[PDB]
UniProtKB/Swiss-Prot annotation, chains A, B:
Signal peptide: none annotated. The lineage of its organism: Eukaryota, Metazoa, Chordata, Craniata, Vertebrata. It is found in: Nucleus, Nucleolus; Nucleus, Nucleoplasm; Nucleus. This is DNA topoisomerase 2-beta. It is linked to Defects in TOP2B may be involved in global developmental delay with autism spectrum disorder (ASD). B-cell immunodeficiency, distal limb anomalies, and urogenital malformations: An autosomal dominant disorder characterized by humoral immunodeficiency with undetectable B cells, distal limb anomalies, dysmorphic facial features, and urogenital malformations. It comes from the Eukaryota. Key decatenating enzyme that alters DNA topology by binding to two double-stranded DNA molecules, generating a double-stranded break in one of the strands, passing the intact strand through the broken strand, and religating the broken strand. Plays a role in B-cell differentiation. There is a cross-link at residues 128-129, 179, 250 (Glycyl lysine isopeptide (Lys-Gly) (interchain with G-Cter in SUMO2)). It comes from Homo sapiens (Human). (Microbial infection) Deubiquitinated by Epstein-Barr virus BPLF1; leading to stabilized SUMOylated TOP2A trapped in cleavage complexes, which halts the DNA damage response to TOP2A-induced double-strand DNA breaks. SUMOylated. Belongs to the type II topoisomerase family. Homodimer. Interacts with KIAA1210. Interacts with PLSCR1. ATP binds at residues 63, 92, 120-122, 133-140, 333-335. Expressed in the tonsil, spleen, lymph node, thymus, skin, pancreas, testis, colon, kidney, liver, brain and lung. Also found in breast, colon and lung carcinomas, Hodgkin's disease, large-cell non-Hodgkin's lymphoma, lymphocytic lymphomas and seminomas.
Amino acid sequence: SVERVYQKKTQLEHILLRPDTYIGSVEPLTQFMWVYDEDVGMNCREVTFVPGLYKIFDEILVNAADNKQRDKNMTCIKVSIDPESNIISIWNNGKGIPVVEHKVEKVYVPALIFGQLLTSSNYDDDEKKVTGGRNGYGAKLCNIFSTKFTVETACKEYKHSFKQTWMNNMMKTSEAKIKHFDGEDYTCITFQPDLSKFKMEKLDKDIVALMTRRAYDLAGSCRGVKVMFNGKKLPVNGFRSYVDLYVKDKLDETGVALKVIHELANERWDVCLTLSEKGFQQISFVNSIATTKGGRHVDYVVDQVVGKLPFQVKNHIWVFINCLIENPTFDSQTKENMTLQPKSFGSKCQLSEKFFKAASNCG
Amino acid sequence: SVERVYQKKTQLEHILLRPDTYIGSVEPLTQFMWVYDEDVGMNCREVTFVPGLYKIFDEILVNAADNKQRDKNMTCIKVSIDPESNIISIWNNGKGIPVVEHKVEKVYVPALIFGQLLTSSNYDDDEKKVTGGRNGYGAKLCNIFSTKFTVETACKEYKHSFKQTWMNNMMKTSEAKIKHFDGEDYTCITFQPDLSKFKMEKLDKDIVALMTRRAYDLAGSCRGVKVMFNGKKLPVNGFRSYVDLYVKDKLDETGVALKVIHELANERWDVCLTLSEKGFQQISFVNSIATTKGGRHVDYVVDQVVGKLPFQVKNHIWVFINCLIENPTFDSQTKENMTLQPKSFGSKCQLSEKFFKAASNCG
Ligand SMILES: Nc1ncnc2c1ncn2[C@@H]1O[C@H](COP(=O)(O)OP(=O)(O)O)[C@@H](O)[C@H]1O
Ligand SMILES: Nc1ncnc2c1ncn2[C@@H]1O[C@H](COP(=O)(O)OP(=O)(O)O)[C@@H](O)[C@H]1O
Ligand SMILES: C[C@H]([C@H](C)[NH+]1CC(=O)NC(=O)C1)[NH+]1CC(=O)NC(=O)C1
Ligand SMILES: [Mg+2]
Ligand SMILES: [Mg+2]
């Protein structure tokens, strides 16, 4: 029959029917990842987790980091995970979201941007503010992949504060609680991922170790923000000290700790380099998004560095990149590989002569 | 201002603003690909092309191949490319699309499924009919990335034929031309890709060589269908003869043509194997989609074959796979890597003892 065979779906129903095209695999994947385990901290090991779950988390986390670019007066992000209750909350300060009726869509601005698809402050490519956000899906994707999803924000400029809760995959919602407000701006997103959509029973060791690492990553990647994880400040300040998490207790060929060369080439390019004993490795960030497969920004810096010293060189390089790119593109929705051409990055990276010399004498 | 900063987009406007998240990169990419060049045919070489363009083409092409699964009485697909006029047309026979009013959406069924987003015959996972189609975007994506887009179809069962033309990125359309019809069913999609969205001036040698290869690929992958390219039947029948396109004039270490082992393990798994002298290579298809990066179906067969003969073995294998999978998933929209777990493929592949023995004595 024609109406059973040929079907239109709503957007919301399409996301739930085709989860993997929006949030990546909802099936387990086993691979070697850098994670931060409670007892031993930063280590590379075999991890089994669901990419789709990692990704709705990372979406809320990158949104906090974007706010720093939105408002440089932002100083802090708190990340909290309660595995036993199934709760994740991410809090930032600095400017909040205007708590007012949008005059075109006739709803409160936070309602619109967390409750309706294809909504964003980043559709105009006002180049400046190099946010990881771009498409206007991430926050709704978390909401839809959650049994419960709470947005609190307050914006002094607009004199009000906002709270609204969503439930059952964004199919159900309270009315906004709206109040007068004159305090410090904050946004706080609190959600319970819908573990049944990922075939998991609990947030397990492996996913909490992955999620914990992204909080370190934020401390490492996001200049000028303290990060607290479960109520504690992460002892990371500057990129070099984040890199130190990885090279702590690594040896060269002669049993001597690794030497690390660092240059902040400009605001958009922070670069550390040492010897690899394990082939080509890279740790890299674009707009605080972890490009774990890398891409054109890694190629761009590595070609330069390889410039001085053919592809056998690449084989002994361990490169750490923290960069900012205008309108990053990715070869998939899980964003581990950034595909933008160098031409249209909006910046250049020229490492100094001091760095190339310093890079000779390290391995 | 709040309504300039916080924006909702329509679906259509979002696709045009964020092309790369739907059709892959709209920027050039340079890499080594198998292509079919007019003069020399199947060869591996350096090619510069736009993934997004390849992909709207491939979407119309996989839809033709899916129809074979829809109706096994289908015998032919004609592919035609006129670079100078900027026209691509793909014709298939076998059952057409019901030319009737959809009683729920109140439009002609072909209008609905080529003119409205998120429309498909493949949303119910009626496992059987292992089509590459699944999400209900592909055909609209071609339409949207076209200056002009024409759908003709006819379905004898429903006594009518249909023609409708779309223009300017699916923003403009004629009324359906609807007629009485009693002839042989066909569907014919004719489009002019919008070269301005891909920064190209003409369909160039490299893209026509890529597109031509997919027609060979179809002849190779789609059992029981003749393929014509620019009015000529492709001299391919069966998978072994397609594989022959690749191994023609290849040598082993002793200057002797490559020996090729073939088994059709079952309808869903056709497998050819020879020696590689160039590391691990694979040519593979899932539901007639070219998995050029491979995935869990390649891993599945290779592990088996590697089973008999550790990862140094992989290094001397050139494997060709034509398979059928129920509800394939992919790690990106350009679908070169298939991510479904073997468990839920809907079939098994056990290669016979004859094949493992035959595979010893080939290199
Ligand atoms: N923590 C936050 N602080 C302030 N604004 C936020 C925060 N999280 C999200 N937003 C706003 O909500 C919008 C919707 O977010 P999202 O769905 O992630 O889309 P985007 O791709 O723009 O990040 C953002 O564009 C931004 O304007
Ligand atoms: N050549 C064809 N012959 C018959 N039906 C077709 C053809 N091309 C497309 N269709 C129909 O149009 C629908 C829309 O196509 P598409 O956007 O590619 O989505 P899907 O992911 O289902 O392939 C298909 O589901 C199928 O029902
Ligand atoms: C929009 C989707 C993208 C993958 N589409 C959905 C689909 O099923 N098929 C397609 O080819 C197009 N992307 C993921 C997401 O969550 N947000 C995006 O805008 C991109
Ligand atoms: Mg975002
Ligand atoms: Mg299709």
